[PDB]
């Protein structure tokens, strides 16, 4: 479940169990964050995922499947 | 810190009470009865208005004033000294790094952040100067990367339309 | 500063405002032996001198302690409001990694 304002700029939703929030100025995603602490996580892995998630809005669907399928393999 | 409690202990009991008790005890030990038990009946009559609490509270006040000018002067001599220029003239993401836990990393900040970073014992000077050089060079490489990728995407659309 | 405390303790001492004359006239009604009363007065000079030098010792020690604690608090404030270059360089390394 996700929350949207009248302009759909702020958003926050759970992919599997972690809070990920996005800020979009326009169609391109300009910011990423991960707001959950699973007790197996390293800070290096945090940076390499948000940077990847940065990009357009249309490739978010393919990237969410690609990035979050490697974690549970 | 409340230095007033410590100073009040020093001038209330450590200084005045000690001298009063020592005077009484030692002059009593000097003996016989009459000489010491009378010679102190005229010390009250001529040291009066010197142990009133209000004016020795003022004594702490004027020692506080002396503290005021000495503290003013040595306050300056320590606080014109600045090691590195203060917080108000630096990048926001730079606080996000130095204080840690940024929770959000992007490219837009860091691009303009390194653009507006000013160049400045030769150890850190040289390494910081060349590292700032390297990073501004890297970000301008990134934006020319936008140039290349955008051109390639448009041309790919052209060639794909022809071939399809 | 220190001289203020010197003046205050000298005012609150016993060795100047108590003179030999009034001492003699106040004692003479009970004991009339001049020599041992002179001895007792001489004892009353020495104790005042020792206690006042001791008072100067305390005031010097307390002044040094005040300088120390005050300077350390002001230094802590300055360090809190000051920036370090090495932490900045460490951050620049991470920025380089992200850009790479």
From Swiss-Prot, chain A:
Component of the kinetochore, a multiprotein complex that assembles on centromeric DNA and attaches chromosomes to spindle microtubules, mediating chromosome segregation and sister chromatid segregation during meiosis and mitosis. Component of the inner kinetochore COMA complex, which connects centromere-associated proteins and the outer kinetochore. COMA interacts with other inner kinetochore proteins to form the inner kinetochore constitutive centromere-associated network (CCAN), which serves as a structural platform for outer kinetochore assembly. This is Inner kinetochore subunit MCM21. The gene is MCM21. Component of the heterotetrameric kinetochore subcomplex COMA, which consists of AME1, CTF19, MCM21 and OKP1. The COMA subcomplex is part of a larger constitutive centromere-associated network (CCAN) (also known as central kinetochore CTF19 complex in yeast), which is composed of at least AME1, CHL4, CNN1, CTF3, CTF19, IML3, MCM16, MCM21, MCM22, MHF1, MHF2, MIF2, NKP1, NKP2, OKP1 and WIP1. COMA binds the centromeric nucleosome-binding protein MIF2, and to the outer kinetochore MIND subcomplex. Present with 952 molecules/cell in log phase SD medium. It comes from the Eukaryota. Belongs to the CENP-O/MCM21 family. It comes from Saccharomyces cerevisiae (strain ATCC 204508 / S288c) (Baker's yeast). The chain holds residues 296 to 368 of 368 of the full protein. It is found in: Nucleus; Chromosome, Centromere, Kinetochore.
UniProtKB/Swiss-Prot annotation, chain B:
It is found in: Nucleus; Chromosome, Centromere, Kinetochore. Signal peptide: none annotated. Its main location: nucleus. The keyword Cell cycle applies. GO terms for biological process: attachment of spindle microtubules to kinetochore; cell division; meiotic cell cycle. Keywords: Cell cycle, Cell division, Centromere, Chromosome, Kinetochore, Meiosis, Mitosis, Nucleus, Phosphoprotein. GO terms for cellular component: kinetochore; nucleus. Belongs to the NKP1 family. Component of the kinetochore, a multiprotein complex that assembles on centromeric DNA and attaches chromosomes to spindle microtubules, mediating chromosome segregation and sister chromatid segregation during meiosis and mitosis. Component of the inner kinetochore constitutive centromere-associated network (CCAN), which serves as a structural platform for outer kinetochore assembly. Component of the inner kinetochore constitutive centromere-associated network (CCAN) (also known as central kinetochore CTF19 complex in yeast), which is composed of at least AME1, CHL4, CNN1, CTF3, CTF19, IML3, MCM16, MCM21, MCM22, MHF1, MHF2, MIF2, NKP1, NKP2, OKP1 and WIP1. NKP1 interacts directly with OKP1 and AME1. This is Inner kinetochore subunit NKP1. It comes from Saccharomyces cerevisiae (strain ATCC 204508 / S288c) (Baker's yeast). The gene is NKP1.
Swiss-Prot record, chain C:
GO terms for cellular component: kinetochore; Mis6-Sim4 complex; nucleus. Keywords: Cell cycle, Cell division, Centromere, Chromosome, Coiled coil, Kinetochore, Meiosis, Mitosis, Nucleus. The keyword Cell cycle applies. It is found in: Nucleus; Chromosome, Centromere, Kinetochore. GO terms for biological process: attachment of spindle microtubules to kinetochore; cell division; chromosome segregation; meiotic cell cycle. The keyword Kinase does not apply. Component of the kinetochore, a multiprotein complex that assembles on centromeric DNA and attaches chromosomes to spindle microtubules, mediating chromosome segregation and sister chromatid segregation during meiosis and mitosis. Component of the inner kinetochore constitutive centromere-associated network (CCAN), which serves as a structural platform for outer kinetochore assembly. Belongs to the NKP2 family. Component of the inner kinetochore constitutive centromere-associated network (CCAN) (also known as central kinetochore CTF19 complex in yeast), which is composed of at least AME1, CHL4, CNN1, CTF3, CTF19, IML3, MCM16, MCM21, MCM22, MHF1, MHF2, MIF2, NKP1, NKP2, OKP1 and WIP1. NKP1 interacts directly with OKP1 and AME1. Present with 1630 molecules/cell in log phase SD medium. This is Inner kinetochore subunit NKP2. It comes from Saccharomyces cerevisiae (strain ATCC 204508 / S288c). The chain holds residues 3 to 102 of 153 of the full protein.
């Amino acid at each position: 479940d996700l929350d949207l304002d009248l302009e759909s700029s702020m958003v926050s939703f759970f992919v599997k169990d972690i809070k990920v929030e996005l800020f979009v100025k326009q169609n391109e995603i300009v910011s990423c964050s991960i707001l959950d602490d699973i007790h197996d996580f390293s800070q290096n892995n945090k940076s390499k995922w948000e940077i990847a998630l940065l990009g357009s809005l249309d490739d978010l669907e393919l990237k969410l499947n690609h990035s979050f399928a490697t974690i549970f393999k | 810190t409340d230095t007033y409690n410590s100073i009040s202990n020093f001038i209330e009991n450590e200084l005045t009470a000690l001298l009063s008790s020592d005077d009484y005890l030692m002059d009593d030990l000097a003996g016989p009865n009459e000489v010491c038990r009378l010679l102190k009946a005229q010390v009250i009559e001529k040291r009066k208005d010197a142990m009133s609490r209000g004016k020795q509270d003022l004594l702490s006040k004027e020692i506080y004033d002396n503290e005021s000018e000495l503290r003013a002067s040595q306050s300056q001599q320590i606080m014109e000294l600045v090691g590195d220029i203060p917080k108000y003239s630096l990048g926001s993401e730079l606080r996000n790094r130095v204080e840690g836990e940024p929770q959000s990393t992007s490219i837009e900040r860091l691009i303009e952040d390194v653009l507006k970073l000013p160049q400045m014992d030769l150890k850190v000077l040289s390494e910081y100067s060349n590292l700032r050089k390297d990073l501004i060079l890297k970000c301008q490489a990134l934006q020319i990367g936008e140039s290349k990728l955008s051109d390639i995407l448009s041309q790919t659309n052209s060639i794909n339309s022809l071939t399809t | 500063s220190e001289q203020l405390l010197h003046n205050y303790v000298s005012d609150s001492l016993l060795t100047t405002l108590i003179s030999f004359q009034e001492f003699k006239q106040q004692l003479q009604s009970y004991t009339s032996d001049e020599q041992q009363l002179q001895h007792w007065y001489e004892l009353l000079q020495a104790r005042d001198a020792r206690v006042t030098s001791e008072l100067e010792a305390r005031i010097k020690q307390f002044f040094i302690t005040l300088r120390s604690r005050l300077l350390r608090f002001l230094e802590s404030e300055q360090l809190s409001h000051s920036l370090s270059l090495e932490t900045l360089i460490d951050a620049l390394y991470k920025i380089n990694d992200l850009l790479q």
